[PDB]
Design a binder for this molecule. Structure first.
Ligand SMILES: [Zn+2]
Lengths: 107, 157
């Protein structure tokens, strides 16, 4: 919204950890997505979120952590401070990784 | 592509924020990006430092690893002998083509493991050794990555 999504639907801004500023994604590396996904709280239960960056290969991420499998899901966390979930991946869909905008910052 | 190389790395050997949920599940691996000579290097890193294994180690544990970083705490005698056990196990189960590096680590303790001992261990197994001053674990990964990059470049042409 604003100078956030390009005409092609890509992220205009870098995506950062809100807590430590680790760079998760470079600009232009992801597509805006309104798919509804459940993300457990980053503390202490969670939110149904529907604004995400959709990334098509794990190696497009600049810096990110993956949790061990929880069923066929892996959650994404900050590589540096490990706060998360900031994102979500279903292993059955090899080319779809979601970073929730509410859970990150943009520079 | 958004990078020039992908290296798979293993971080082994014993030695503050908080996310409980994440503490409960545990980290599988991390992806990090660095630059070396203006090339973009993607690192996929599994770190089992501070982690004792219960499970018996197989070839499946080291398959695909391109570099292994071996860490011990210079203040700890157990942690140093623990790296000697690891070096033994790697030589048996990991590819003989894997790059390896030993790191003598560690603010706040008496040094219990000498630098000569660390240097002599690397010599006995024919691999590099760093004691991490302005020189730390990050510099070590850059060096390990440098070494994998050089080897890799020749192979391609
Ligand atoms: Zn962070």
């Amino acid at each position: 919204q604003g100078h956030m999504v390009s005409a092609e639907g890509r992220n205009r801004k870098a995506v950062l950890c809100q807590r430590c500023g680790s760079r998760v994604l470079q600009p232009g590396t992801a597509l805006f997505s309104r798919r509804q996904l459940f993300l457990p709280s980053m503390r202490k239960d969670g939110d149904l979120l529907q604004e995400h960056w959709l990334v098509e290969d794990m190696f497009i991420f600049e810096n990110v952590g993956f949790t061990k499998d929880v069923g066929n899901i892996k959650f994404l966390v900050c590589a540096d401070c490990e706060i998360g979930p900031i994102g979500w991946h279903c292993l059955d869909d090899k080319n779809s990784f979601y970073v929730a905008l509410e859970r990150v910052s943009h520079e | 592509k958004t990078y020039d190389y992908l290296f798979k790395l293993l971080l082994i050997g014993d030695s503050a924020f908080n996310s409980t949920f994440i503490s409960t599940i545990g980290i599988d691996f991390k992806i990090r990006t660095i630059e070396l000579d203006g090339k973009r290097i993607k690192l996929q890193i599994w770190d089992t430092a501070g982690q004792e294994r219960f499970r018996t180690i197989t070839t499946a544990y080291y398959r695909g690893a391109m570099g292994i970083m071996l860490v011990y705490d210079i203040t700890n005698e157990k942690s140093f002998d623990n790296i000697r056990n690891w070096i033994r196990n790697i030589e048996e189960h990991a590819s003989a083509d894997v790059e390896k590096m030993i790191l003598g680590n560690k603010d706040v303790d008496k040094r219990q493991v000498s630098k000569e001992r660390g240097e002599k261990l690397a010599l006995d197994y024919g691999i590099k050794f760093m004691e991490t001053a302005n020189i730390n674990v990050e510099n070590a990964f850059f060096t390990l990555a440098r070494d994998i990059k050089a080897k890799m470049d020749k192979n391609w042409k």
